[PDB]
Design a binder for this molecule. Structure first.
Ligand SMILES: *[C@@H]1O[C@H](CO)[C@@H](O[C@@H]2O[C@H](CO)[C@@H](O[C@@H]3O[C@H](CO[C@H]4O[C@H](CO)[C@@H](O)[C@H](O[C@H]5O[C@H](CO)[C@@H](O)[C@H](O)[C@@H]5O[C@H]5O[C@H](CO)[C@@H](O)[C@H](O)[C@@H]5O)[C@@H]4O)[C@@H](O)[C@H](O[C@H]4O[C@H](CO)[C@@H](O)[C@H](O)[C@@H]4O[C@H]4O[C@H](CO)[C@@H](O)[C@H](O)[C@@H]4O)[C@@H]3O)[C@H](O)[C@H]2NC(C)=O)[C@H](O)[C@H]1NC(C)=O
Ligand SMILES: CNC(=O)C[C@H](NC(=O)COc1c(CN(C)Cc2nc(C)cs2)cccc1OC)c1cccc(C(F)(F)F)c1
Ligand SMILES: [Ca+2]
Ligand code: NA
Ligand code: NA
Ligand SMILES: [Zn+2]
Length: 806
């Protein structure tokens, strides 16, 4: 119940919201059907429109008008935004030349530059170039401020998950808004775009920017606008708040627009109907900037122009139907569209089996336009599994397609030409970032980055301590003139042991054999030098990785590679080696096919054994430093050490061997040498974080050798590829991957073909940031370089996406 008999007089767009049954007058009262009876009359005036005209100038104030052109309007804070232009001979902001804003120029009373967020729904990154002719205000923000060519949204590339990620710095799996539609099985409740359940705070986790501000004494304008409030009224409300007394005035504001998304769904991302929506959003930016100029705030405020996701061409005819795959289609509930999520229709169904559902959806039709995954097997870069609202079965839908349960859902539930939600590396899903103001840089282009990073910077802009989030604070310091955040490197928690030769060969009873007794004062000294770290500069180019948790491990040096060997997990945490452009690939010699050799520096009790692999009929082994890239026949023996061995399913060994035998040399050739760090990852609870020993669900049969869920590589070279990776004077270049360690290649529909036709495609899908590997391993990379720490943080957030140019 709401007592709508109360009044909005002197309360229009009040900041503090009131509780039922008292009627409301805030930004969202319409969405709750709770506005006071006179809210439209008092708060939503429209008389005479939104613009001053020459005949209105100096008018007698009429309080009924939407905005004012009377001599008193500036002191009242409610002039039409073009008042000074029409009535006082001023220029529109867009018409003024860009001039660098070196320092804030703020009116007295202003404690800090205000932050104004201008959020646009469905604004695809390429509109900034493709639409620049019809968007002169936006184009001036972009050219004169700081801009990226695009900003990467989060998956799924839907509205509510991305806007809330913008606000919180969190992945959707952490903030809880994991789709526009959700079912939470603990609450037994459903969240939908339409309706009241979505207002319950239990759905909205983390801590959004307006709550971080308010908790630390910084006042915030409300970030939400009921859809029926015209954009012109939203802008005038923001400008009116900006004229409040100092102690009442907010420091952070947001505007939101439903466009260009609304028209993009109807017309497709580049439909001829799309120009007018772009012109109108531009005109709204111009209102804001003219209004700021009137308030003398246009060289004081920092403005962020930002979108949630882009827009792809999608039509009703490009829909896959699960009814063409499943015998049992009425036993499942599908959350449909540009992603699919599947759960049982009834929890009382003992006939429900996700294994038979996955198999019936796997590579069944030659041009099949979606791929099924158990969520834990989705690319780790998506960070889309650790939430009970995310269904176990996931369908990743190809760009331009939909998935639906049955045909009748598509005509009884073509209209639309555009949609979004696909994989967040897809070019059409990328969106926009421009920052303009005293705290941003002048005429500066910055490389693409992730929307999770902005919360830290907005906190930086407002003098706030950010709540814990998934940004890497400092990785965006190059966007900023001042207010940078100067992080320190984390301290190493575990120091390594450096074992020498401590065991005789006969102390080992591992069931391994090697034809190595085929093997000199000159050159024995040399091998001793290698085992003590004499080639280590060549192979560990950025320092040893620091271990940020408590564990027991050894540094092991070799001619061709260096590793940190865990005595707890019985295998390396990391293995680091450099391959020059001139490096030669060799074979594994016939007499060494089955060679595994005890490592006389590491106890038998802290070693793997061969008999366990013999006995486990599902599990084989591979090597982290590849025997194919040995520098000499004699150095090659090192590659067969029991301390370089890792458990690998035979199907996975097809992938790994092609990566090691073929692709590393190809990258060294292309990049002018590469430094590679490889290793295992254990993430059995799919939380994106390193597992402890007691979270491991699978071991090589009969042993304490834990089985990795994934294997990573970080591949680093010189950004200036005229310099070799090992003699690089300036910035670095990196690509990395986190490959799922699976017992089949069901993910790759073409895997019966030669590895050259499918492996690199798999690896591309599983591309990763170095930061993703850090979370999954508890290791900190790039500890000793010539580079600034913020530059290294940017490097660690880089994702190599393999898309063509935006
Ligand atoms: C991205 O950044 C985010 C933010 O930094 C990272 O997420 C953090 O990761 C931490 C570890 O996973 C986690 O810390 C835990 O917090 C527990 C208390 O959590 C509550 O309080 C915080 C603070 O206000 C709050 O933010 C939490 O909010 C979560 O949960 C609510 C309700 O479900 C949601 O609305 C909200 O969206 C959020 O959910 C997300 O996180 C939870 C986990 O908290 C997931 O379940 C969800 O799926 C979703 O992803 C909470 O309200 C604290 O109690 C934990 O401690 C346990 O474990 C340790 C082991 O050392 C032990 O000391 C404790 O005893 C305890 O164990 C006991 O409980 C176990 C299970 O019941 C049981 O097995 C044991 O036997 C014990 O009894 C732990 O410290 C932190 O909460 C989240 N924060 C957020 C916002 O998500 C994220 O990791 C980053 N991602 C990457 C890839 O880097
Ligand atoms: C019909 N309109 C809609 O459906 C969307 C519209 N959204 C908004 O008015 C503001 O959008 C959001 C922002 C806004 N914020 C400004 C984006 C940010 N960008 C940065 C950079 C930080 S925060 C941040 C976080 C989540 C957001 O929405 C879920 C809306 C209208 C009515 C009610 C709701 C709700 F309560 F259900 F959520 C949502
Ligand atoms: Ca884990
Ligand atoms: Na085996
Ligand atoms: Na296959
Ligand atoms: Zn949309």
């Amino acid at each position: 119940w709401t007592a709508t008999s109360g009044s909005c007089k002197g309360r229009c767009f009040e900041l503090q919201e009131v509780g039922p049954p008292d009627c409301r007058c805030d930004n969202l009262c319409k969405s709750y059907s709770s506005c006071c009876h006179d809210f439209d009359e008092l708060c939503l005036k429209t008389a005479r429109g939104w613009e001053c005209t020459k005949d209105r100038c100096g008018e007698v104030r009429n309080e009924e008008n939407a905005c004012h052109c009377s001599e008193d309007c500036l002191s009242r804070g409610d002039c039409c935004t073009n008042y000074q232009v029409v009535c006082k001979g001023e220029s529109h902001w867009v018409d003024d030349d860009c001039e660098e804003i070196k320092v804030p120029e703020c009116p007295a009373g202003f404690v800090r530059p205000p932050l104004i967020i201008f959020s646009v729904d469905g604004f695809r990154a390429s509109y900034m170039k493709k639409g620049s002719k019809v968007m002169p205000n936006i184009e001036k923000l972009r050219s004169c401020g700081t801009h990226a060519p695009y900003m990467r949204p989060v998956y799924p590339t839907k509205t509510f998950p991305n806007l809330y990620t913008l606000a919180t710095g969190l992945y959707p799996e952490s903030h809880g808004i994991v789709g526009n539609s959700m079912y939470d099985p603990v609450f037994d409740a459903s969240f939908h775009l339409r309706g009241r359940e979505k207002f319950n705070h239990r759905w909205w986790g983390g801590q959004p920017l307006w709550i971080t501000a308010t908790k630390q004494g910084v006042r915030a304008g409300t970030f939400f606008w009921s859809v029926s409030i015209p954009h012109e009224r939203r802008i005038l409300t923001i400008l009116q708040w900006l004229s409040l007394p100092d102690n009442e005035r907010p420091s952070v504001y947001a505007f939101y627009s439903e466009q260009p998304d609304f028209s993009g769904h109807k017309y497709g991302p580049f439909g001829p109907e799309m120009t007018n929506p772009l012109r109108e959003i531009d005109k709204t930016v111009g209102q804001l900037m003219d209004g700021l100029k009137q308030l003398r705030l246009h060289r004081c405020v920092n403005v962020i122009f930002v979108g949630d996701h882009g827009m792809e061409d999608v039509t009703c005819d490009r829909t896959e139907f699960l009814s063409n795959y499943l015998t049992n289609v009425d036993d499942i509930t599908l959350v449909p569209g540009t992603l699919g999520r599947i759960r049982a229709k009834s929890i009382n169904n003992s006939k429900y089996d996700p294994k038979t559902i996955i198999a019936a959806l796997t590579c069944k039709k030659p041009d099949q336009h979606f791929k099924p995954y158990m969520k834990q097997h989705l690319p780790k870069r998506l960070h889309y599994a650790n939430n009970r609202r995310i269904e176990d079965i996931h369908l990743l839908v190809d760009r331009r397609w939909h998935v639906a349960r049955k045909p009748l859902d598509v005509y009884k539930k073509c209209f639309f030409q555009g949609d979004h939600g696909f994989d967040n590396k897809v070019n059409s899903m990328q969106t926009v970032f421009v920052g303009y103001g005293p705290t941003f840089k002048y005429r500066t282009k910055v490389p693409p980055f992730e929307n999770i990073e902005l919360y830290n910077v907005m906190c930086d802009l407002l003098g706030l301590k950010p709540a814990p989030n998934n940004g890497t604070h400092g990785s965006l310091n190059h966007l900023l003139r001042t207010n940078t955040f100067r992080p320190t490197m984390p301290d190493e928690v575990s120091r390594p042991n450096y074992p020498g030769i401590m065991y005789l060969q006969s102390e080992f009873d591992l069931g391994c054999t090697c034809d190595d007794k085929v093997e000199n004062k000159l050159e024995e000294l040399n091998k001793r030098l290698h085992t003590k770290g004499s080639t280590k500069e060549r192979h560990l180019l950025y320092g040893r990785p620091a271990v940020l948790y408590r564990t027991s491990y050894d540094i092991l040096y070799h001619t061709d590679f260096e590793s940190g060997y865990s005595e707890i997990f019985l295998m390396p945490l990391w293995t680091s080696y450099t391959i020059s452009k001139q490096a030669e690939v060799s074979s594994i010699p016939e007499h060494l096919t089955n060679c595994v050799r005890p490592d006389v520096r590491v106890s038998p009790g802290f070693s793997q054994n061969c008999l366990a692999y013999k006995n486990d009929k599902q599990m084989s082994y591979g090597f982290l430093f590849p025997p194919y890239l040995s520098s000499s026949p004699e150095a090659k023996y090192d590659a067969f050490l029991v301390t370089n061995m890792v458990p690998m399913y035979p199907a996975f060994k097809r992938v790994w061997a092609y990566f090691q035998r073929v692709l590393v040399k190809k990258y060294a050739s292309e990049r002018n040498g590469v430094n590679v760090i490889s290793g295992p990852i254990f993430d059995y609870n799919y939380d994106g974080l390193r597992d402890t020993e007691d979270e491991i669900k699978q071991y090589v049969e009969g042993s304490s050798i834990p089985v990795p869920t994934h294997y990573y590589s970080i591949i680093t070279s010189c950004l200036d590829f005229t310099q070799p990776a090992d003699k690089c004077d300036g910035p670095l270049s990196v690509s990395s991957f986190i490959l799922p360690h699976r017992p089949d290649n069901d993910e790759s529909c073409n895997s019966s073909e030669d590895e050259s036709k499918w492996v690199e495609e798999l690896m591309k899908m599983h591309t990763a940031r170095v930061r993703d590997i850090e979370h999954l391993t508890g290791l900190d990379f790039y500890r000793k370089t010539s580079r600034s720490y913020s530059e290294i943080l940017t490097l660690k957030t880089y994702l190599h996406t393999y898309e063509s140019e935006i």
